[PDB]
Write a protein that binds this ligand. Sequence first.
Ligand SMILES: COC(=O)N[C@@H]1O[C@H](CO)[C@@H](O)[C@H](O)[C@H]1O
Ligand SMILES: COC(=O)N[C@@H]1O[C@H](CO)[C@@H](O)[C@H](O)[C@H]1O
Ligand SMILES: *Cc1c(COP(=O)(O)O)cnc(C)c1O
Ligand SMILES: *Cc1c(COP(=O)(O)O)cnc(C)c1O
Lengths: 830, 830
Amino acid sequence: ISVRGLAGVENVTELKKNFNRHLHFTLVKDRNVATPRDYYFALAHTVRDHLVGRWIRTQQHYYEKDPKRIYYLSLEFYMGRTLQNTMVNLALENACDEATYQLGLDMEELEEIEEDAGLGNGGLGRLAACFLDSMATLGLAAYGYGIRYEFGIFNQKICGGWQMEEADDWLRYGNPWEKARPEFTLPVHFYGRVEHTSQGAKWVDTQVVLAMPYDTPVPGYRNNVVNTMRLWSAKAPNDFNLKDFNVGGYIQAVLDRNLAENISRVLYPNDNFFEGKELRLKQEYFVVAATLQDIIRRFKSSKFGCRDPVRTNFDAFPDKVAIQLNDTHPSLAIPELMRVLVDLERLDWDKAWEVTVKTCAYTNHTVIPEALERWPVHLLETLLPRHLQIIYEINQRFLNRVAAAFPGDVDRLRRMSLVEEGAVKRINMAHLCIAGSHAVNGVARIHSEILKKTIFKDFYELEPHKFQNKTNGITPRRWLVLCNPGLAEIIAERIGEEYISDLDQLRKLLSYVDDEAFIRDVAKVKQENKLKFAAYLEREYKVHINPNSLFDVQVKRIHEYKRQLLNCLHVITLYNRIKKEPNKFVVPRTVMIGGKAAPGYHMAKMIIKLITAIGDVVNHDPVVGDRLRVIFLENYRVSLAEKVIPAADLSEQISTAGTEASGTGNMKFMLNGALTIGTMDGANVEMAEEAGEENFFIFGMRVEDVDRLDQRGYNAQEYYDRIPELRQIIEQLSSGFFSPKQPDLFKDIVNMLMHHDRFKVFADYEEYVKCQERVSALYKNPREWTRMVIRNIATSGKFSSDRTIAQYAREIWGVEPSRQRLPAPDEKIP
Amino acid sequence: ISVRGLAGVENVTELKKNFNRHLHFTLVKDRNVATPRDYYFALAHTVRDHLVGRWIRTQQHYYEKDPKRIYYLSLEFYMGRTLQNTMVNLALENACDEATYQLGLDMEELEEIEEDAGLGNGGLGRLAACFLDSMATLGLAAYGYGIRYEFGIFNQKICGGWQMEEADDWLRYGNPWEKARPEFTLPVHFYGRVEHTSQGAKWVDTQVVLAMPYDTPVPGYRNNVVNTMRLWSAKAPNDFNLKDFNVGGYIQAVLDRNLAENISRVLYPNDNFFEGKELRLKQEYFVVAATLQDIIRRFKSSKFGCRDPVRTNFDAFPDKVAIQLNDTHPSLAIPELMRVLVDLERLDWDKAWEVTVKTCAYTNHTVIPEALERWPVHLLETLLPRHLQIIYEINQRFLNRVAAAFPGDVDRLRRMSLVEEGAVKRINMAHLCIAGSHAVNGVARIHSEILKKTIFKDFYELEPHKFQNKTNGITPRRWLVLCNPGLAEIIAERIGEEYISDLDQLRKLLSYVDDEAFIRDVAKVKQENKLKFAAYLEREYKVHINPNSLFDVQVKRIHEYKRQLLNCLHVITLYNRIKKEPNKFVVPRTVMIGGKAAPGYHMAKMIIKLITAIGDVVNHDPVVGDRLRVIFLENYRVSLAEKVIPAADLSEQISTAGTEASGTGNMKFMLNGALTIGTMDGANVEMAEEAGEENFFIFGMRVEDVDRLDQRGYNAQEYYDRIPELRQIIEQLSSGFFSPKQPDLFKDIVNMLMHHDRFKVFADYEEYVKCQERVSALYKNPREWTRMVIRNIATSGKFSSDRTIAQYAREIWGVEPSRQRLPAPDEKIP
Ligand SMILES: COC(=O)N[C@@H]1O[C@H](CO)[C@@H](O)[C@H](O)[C@H]1O
Ligand SMILES: COC(=O)N[C@@H]1O[C@H](CO)[C@@H](O)[C@H](O)[C@H]1O
Ligand SMILES: *Cc1c(COP(=O)(O)O)cnc(C)c1O
Ligand SMILES: *Cc1c(COP(=O)(O)O)cnc(C)c1O
């Protein structure tokens, strides 16, 4: 059937009865009233059974051996479905497929019932998920810590061409994967005030919110390792949240509990955009405060909570603990770790600081200003009084270091301050992380260089040793084996299976670049993938596409910097050229654009309307025929990604040079047989470098060109004046060609493009369409297109998250990865 | 060990492995970190397994055979713990005891970990629970329908002698008994307006709240019948509760979902007191609307949703459906059933009314005015516009019936109206229920007579046939076998086990009234029960009592009509007499008073403070010694009831004649070997009548005496003037004898007693203490005390809820009870 494992005689039999056990005893249903949803759950529970045994021994193991623990703090974990992935990592796929088949059910149909765990916005959240899978696969004692939002990223609905947001009630039917652990609930404080008494400061009169943990297993790839992802849920104490007496109403007191519990209610739907709301700050401290108590408790036991030097010496804390900050969201971990160490454990400042810096590491994910976290002091002042005092003290000593290093450099001092003066004072969370971490890293080579050259230049000059780079990656398991079994199979037929956990081995595929059978095969799976997607499209969304055309897709969050607008300009151009010479042949294309716009991002929502507007015109022009279709992919999310990417021919990674930190979708397309048209931005540079620029479609300004243009000054009118095709498009938008009933509907877009385009869309227009012509040329030559594809796939090895994690492990955490199978799952009950 | 069933070889072995299965696979724990709470859950899940098989066949059975269905609508279901009760009804107690013993655990210690399902206030809620157990035991196709509050009756804490309320988070660790059924979610409407168009009225522009059902199994006693209790939970739709666009905030929209979900958040903590809050009315319509849709759906399938006359003829609705209204709380079921029938199914008014009256039955539970539900019209007008129109139309036609029956009786008309004029117009829910039901019943003989003679006199004259009586009862299983195995065993040793489901057989115990062995035994278990409680007291609450004294207990909600104050007066009297003649012998007594006060009931909370105040003085007077102890039993609830009742010698049922509809605690004490001192009120009359007045301690005014006094006019001063002992007590209260630091602390109590005592406490004082002297006299004669006890126990048979349900079944529902064992639980998987 494929290498989805063995369909053993004994195990298929065993699976079936357990499937039935759960259907009866767990779901309390009988075959005569069971629905596909019920069947999905019976299976989910059956599969979940297979990893609890392993989950328990793994955790027990780490308790015995006591290795250094890695704590990944992130406010986002874009998990997606977990049934299939679990079967894959446990080598259960074929057996389950067989068993469910014999039970008369279609496993694939059941898999579609699983709701996505959308606790993330996009790139940042998904990275955390790929990281977890890699850390488990590499045998690291790692823990993912976050918040269990009951409402993840909103589900997107297109009404009349506009995006409509609606709550993502992903827990409505329950989550068979998590395990509530109410017995490990911890308290978290808010507000209050600081008392300075005799021997130390005291955080007093605080409001308490309880943090209840929920564990979700994270299985490594076929190594019997199952790590844990702990998500915190907000709960109100039953005392004060009722006991603070003297009139108000008993009923009202109980109803008001949903005020402390709102903390974990919903994820902020912003991608690369900072919103300074109190609720957000509350979420950030909540995950930090709870997690740290858990971290220290585990440390206090270790082998110190037995003997060792005997005396809670936190000197070995950094040797046993490592906490990674996914961006600045969990930045309060630094001042909080100090608070605990100094205020509660009573360590001197300097000893506490040394420990903190040695255990904390910060990862930067963006350079755009509107995404940078700068919290107003009055907010920290009211909500976390002691933490503000600690930050000021950290700032004081840091700046003193600076003054000593650069005597007289008074401007440098204000520039490096963690505190920003002006309208309202703010705290620069990024500056805080750099100061309190022993390592700071970018997520791609160019992004990391930009940090040292620009944004954190002064910091780099002060402590050059702190700065590193760790190019992002993706997990080959979900992003290849899971979503594209067809391609994984033909690859395995030639080079084996060892590449799933050693993607570098994909290079061996280079020697088949001229193999006639392979070229035919690679081309076949892609054709099958395109047919399956073209079908899914009419199944769930309804209105036909042509599987023979070039599948041009751009899927990512909607942003001005991602330039979906540039993509739009090209599409309209193609249309106009066809309308000019109708009977001229052109390579057919189905351009698919999908992504979510943050609810408050007006422009982004305006772009979504433009896309659909274009499709309205283009898709109903009889002269165009099936040569050009414009489709907006609704509710783009992980599960949808697993469907389009494998079916894509052209991958669009067209951000303005210097704005996309790294990107990861790009990597997903490269590993799945799509060719990339893009700018020298983020990881695109390293991808072209790995596959050879001749096998990549690069165009547009490089970072330097962008800066040159900024010195000069960017004037869009120039481009409008010298390019007739471009002029024609702008006037079509301005006159209502795409919006008859509402002629001025797109005035904001036009106005912005001509007068305030922060991402110079026009500057890259000419080189972009020229380059697009080159891909169409190559598409006309199937054999060569596929051979170039083989060049990309065979050279994408470097972009596996196993490589990234191996690097974090050695160069930052100080731990050695291991591909050693944990001693089987075998029963055991001590 | 006892007759808690057989401890079979094969089954104890089977239990153990399943216990371990769940500990591992369900709880995801290993013996080395498992705590008593974990062990409790493993067991709970193991036991729950044994009734799913039966639960599924029972429900399937009712689908095949299709009998008349009984729907018990109540806003309260005081369930208490369900582990033990389930073992008892399934004959699993000894096997589980054995198995857990072999696993090295103490089952009893594990049982104490289970949280009480406190979805009730007192008598009314607990009745619904005993009824459910009886309906299952009698093989009726019955369904309990209610609301799944996430916060039940508050947990009571005594701080400085005052009651402190705190949220009862009973779901904190989960509920292993319920089964969420999200797939059966139904919509419920609110607000909106009524449109009258061509062919009918339309309820339009309503706000929708979703109702999610949760099923809990209700096992009959050893008959393999497992009925269902369906509890509704409020959930917000994800559309409009987000989709009603045009600014407000996406985040705020999601946080505001906890506004529609507040409906099922908390139970109103009032006992015999009406609060006209909108939230309450919302809860009342919510449970009614959702339940009815479920009732009709089931009917539409029956055997009509196949063939029969073919044509949705609701003529047979009453032949297949019976809905019982537990008080007026679910009264909206009447106008709602009309709305559906008329508005949606399009039946003519008269046909719809005939059907409604024929399927609905109403049970009255009180006669005090402050407990009667009278909803302001403006509230119904805004929240349920169409229902108000239906009520007015029902009223119109009803009054016309009256006018026709009593021509010219204009005062009768206004008196009987469902609509009350005055300050604000109100709807008399009681009048609505009487008009739209084919039967109305009281809960005790005297209560039922009072209804016909007083409160519903006019209604009784109009339709004498509607009025009946159904004396309350209690379940011998939980209230005897479960809480008092020791007494159940010795009873079984003599007369067998058939009495557990046929309590009338207890009469055979009369012939052992002179048996020397029995008298010794009955006296022994009571002594053991008193020792176990005296221990529990120091274990969980701490501060010693004497197990040789007479255990005088009064446990029920705190009310002015229940007269805990009268009990107080006696206690203070005993104290004063001892202080007068210290060296005179008196029968030692431990008077225990426990109960909860509604949060807004000032007087009730003042009484709780008085009780503790008395104990402060009495319990620390060296001259008193161990002859008199005053203890306030904290957080009285079902689980606590199961502990005190079996250990009680004297049961206090001292309400003012004519105020306690029936009472059920009284019955609990009678069946458990306690003697009753009380007034001729509620079921007390029938209990004395059953045991012979010579074996009961009756005192005080009868209903007639109370009325005589009211004609005359009640003047408390008279009693104060003629009774020195009474005067002495009042002046002790007035001078701060019981409240040194705050001398005027009890001025409200004294003032009320002297000037506005609605329950003439003083009028029954003299006869009460005189009578109390008589019980002390008899207590001094162990042999005779125990013989009188045997007379009560042997004659309590009539008070089993099996008898009550058998009566409801035959005289109201039109169904025949059956003690036929359902065809085993045996595997089966069709
Ligand atoms: C807060 O900034 C981010 O969300 N950054 C995003 O992170 C991911 C993961 O590193 C990067 O690949 C994207 O280019 C960047 O925009
Ligand atoms: C709303 O009134 C009630 O709660 N009534 C109560 O119901 C129970 C059950 O019938 C009776 O035994 C009590 O005497 C009565 O007060
Ligand atoms: C991988 C992924 C992303 C990141 O895409 P980019 O193109 O790097 O911005 C965002 N959303 C989903 C659903 C993804 O799978
Ligand atoms: C039976 C019971 C009641 C009813 O007691 P009465 O004395 O009839 O008012 C109230 N509370 C609990 C916990 C009960 O078990």
